[PDB]
């Protein structure tokens, strides 16, 4: 049934977007004696925070440095500001405390993802996407040998097990391994769902496709409410993985009640298709995992993303039927690129406009994915149609490289978004030359 696959892809969407909320970084500072000790520390907590922690980014108290001694010189206005020396600070060693207003417990606040380990969250996303790649590369022969239903049930069981395991992970490497196995099973489910929806009915192939995307969509759209309802990441992952335990009931139908010629042949079409897939995967998995910086409210941002991505990718099929395949694809790619570029061009004070631009860019990359996945079925004849698998592998590689460019935020907060806006523009300019 199509409804079962839609529910499955919606829950896989919740599992995928779980990383955007469980790895959210709140405003943090490390333990200070004049702010977290007993009453003897004294009134005016802002003055205590100012004299105990030097200023930092965005004219805020430094989230990564603490004063070893209380600097009373900055509190009295008669003295010159920024008079403290660098030697008076200590490397924020006494452990970090986090704001429990928005999120009560996250993977950043649990394992102390701080300056020295700030690359762990993008490294965790990269490990997840590498697990996705390994699963997509491995479950192929497994599905061809052991059957699609058996590997589907095994992947569902693995998703459930790894979800319940990562919900209670005591260490960071163990959590990374759990996420790697969960991503392996996610990729297995993805491959099986794609292989089944490609040939269950198909003329109706574009309709079925539009459909699994209206899918991941209703998804991010429902995962925002789930993240808003459950403030603890452990119980959040638990209640996200329980639906997979429920879907495991359909195992065994209720108990019975090669192709390397894609590179030399059509090399131009092959490289262009792989470039578009790489660009889409890169942009999507680089933007959909850092929504905290793209908007002011992550939940409202995701809800707006979904409610605007529904009609865009709905009319994407009308555009494909009326205007063609290449023109609408190039137009959507250029629109997404221009939106992500204007997201950096606009100042950060226009939060609503930044959120709107991010939503428009995500809708554009979704429409571009729809266009390219409809066009890949006609770029190559039946003899060459594993070009689709090669494009999928290229998109997975782009997804993997996605979080790796986010490390450039030290050189500037706009560089990752600058790349996320520049890559789709070049992708559309290259796809414009398609026949
Ligand atoms: O990862 C993939 C993916 C990769 C390949 Cl190679 C595929 O063939 C397919 Cl169908 C999906 N995503 C991530 S997503 O947000 O679910 C999402 C939403 C909409 C379209 C694709 C897609």
UniProtKB/Swiss-Prot annotation:
A molecular-function term among this protein's GO annotations: PDZ domain binding
Glycosylation sites: 37, 78
Effect after changing residue 354 to H: In RHUC1; uncertain significance; reduced urate transport; abolishes localization to cell membrane
Annotated Gene Ontology cellular component terms: apical plasma membrane; brush border membrane; extracellular exosome; membrane; plasma membrane
PROSITE patterns (alphabetical): MFS
Effect recorded for residue 140 to S: In RHUC1; reduced urate transport
Transmembrane feature ranges: 122-142, 150-170, 171-191, 207-227, 235-255, 271-291, 298-318, 327-347, 355-375, 386-405, 414-434
Subcellular location: Apical cell membrane
Processing and modification events after translation: N-glycosylated.
Cysteine pairings via disulfide bonds: none
Result for mutant: residue 286 to R: In RHUC1; reduced urate transport; reduced localization at the plasma membrane
A biological process term (GO) from this entry: monoatomic ion transport
CDD domains reported in the protein's UniProt record: MFS_OAT (cd17374)
Membrane-topology annotation of the record: Multi-pass membrane protein
Pfam families: MFS_1
Top-rank taxon: Eukaryota
Catalytic activity: urate(out) + (S)-lactate(in) = urate(in) + (S)-lactate(out); nicotinate(in) + urate(out) = nicotinate(out) + urate(in); urate(out) + n chloride(in) = urate(in) + n chloride(out); orotate(out) + nicotinate(in) = orotate(in) + nicotinate(out)
Function statement: Electroneutral antiporter that translocates urate across the apical membrane of proximal tubular cells in exchange for monovalent organic or inorganic anions. Involved in renal reabsorption of urate and helps maintaining blood levels of uric acid. Mediates urate uptake by an exchange with organic anions such as (S)-lactate and nicotinate, and inorganic anion Cl(-). Other inorganic anions such as Br(-), I(-) and NO3(-) may also act as counteranions that exchange for urate.
Entry-linked PANTHER family: SOLUTE CARRIER FAMILY 22 MEMBER
Family stated for the protein in its record: Belongs to the major facilitator (TC 2.A.1) superfamily. Organic cation transporter (TC 2.A.1.19) family.
Protein name in the entry: Solute carrier family 22 member 12
Organism: Homo sapiens
Gene designation: SLC22A12
């Amino acid at each position: 049934q199509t409804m079962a696959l839609m529910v499955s892809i919606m829950w896989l969407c919740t599992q995928s977007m779980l990383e955007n909320f469980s790895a959210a970084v709140p405003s943090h500072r490390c333990w200070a004696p004049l702010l977290d000790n007993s009453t003897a520390q004294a009134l005016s907590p802002e003055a205590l925070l100012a004299i105990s922690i030097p200023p930092g980014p965005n004219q805020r108290p430094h989230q990564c440095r603490r004063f070893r001694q209380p600097q009373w010189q900055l509190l009295d206005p008669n003295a010159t500001a920024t008079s403290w020396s660098e030697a008076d600070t200590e490397p924020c060693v006494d452990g970090w405390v986090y704001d429990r207003s928005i999120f009560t417990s996250t993977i950043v606040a649990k394992w102390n993802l701080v300056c020295d380990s700030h690359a762990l969250k993008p490294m965790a996303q990269s490990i997840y996407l590498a697990g996705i790649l390994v699963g997509a590369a491995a479950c192929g022969p497994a599905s061809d040998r052991f059957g699609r239903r058996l590997v589907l049930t095994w992947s569902y069981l693995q998703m459930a097990v790894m979800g319940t395991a990562a919900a209670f992970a005591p260490a960071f490497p163990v959590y990374c391994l759990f996420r790697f196995l969960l991503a392996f099973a996610v990729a297995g489910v993805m491959m099986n769902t794609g292989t089944l929806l490609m040939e269950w009915t198909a003329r109706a192939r574009p309709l079925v496709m539009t459909l699994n995307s209206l899918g991941f969509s209703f998804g991010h759209g429902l995962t925002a409410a789930v993240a808003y309802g459950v403030r603890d990441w452990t119980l959040l992952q638990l209640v996200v993985s329980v639906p997979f335990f429920l879907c495991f009931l359909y195992s065994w139908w209720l108990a019975e009640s090669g192709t390397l010629l894609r590179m030399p042949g059509l090399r131009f079409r092959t490289c262009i298709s792989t470039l578009c897939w790489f660009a889409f995967g890169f942009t999507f998995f680089g933007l959909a995992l850092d929504l905290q910086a793209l908007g002011s409210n992550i939940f409202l941002l995701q809800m707006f993303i979904g409610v605007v991505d529904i009609p865009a990718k709905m009319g994407a099929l009308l555009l494909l039927s009326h205007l063609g395949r290449r023109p609408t694809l190039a137009a959507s790619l250029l629109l997404a690129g221009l939106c992500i570029l204007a997201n950096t061009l606009v100042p950060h004070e226009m939060g609503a406009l930044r959120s709107a631009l991010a939503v428009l860019g995500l809708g554009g990359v979704g429409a571009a994915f729809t266009c390219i996945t409809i066009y890949s079925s006609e770029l190559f004849p039946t003899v060459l149609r594993t070009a689709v698998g090669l494009g999928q592998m290229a998109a997975r590689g782009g997804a993997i490289l996605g979080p790796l460019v986010r490390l450039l935020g030290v050189h500037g907060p706009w560089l990752p978004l600058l790349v996320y806006g520049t890559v789709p523009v070049l992708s559309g300019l290259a796809a414009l030359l398609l026949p």
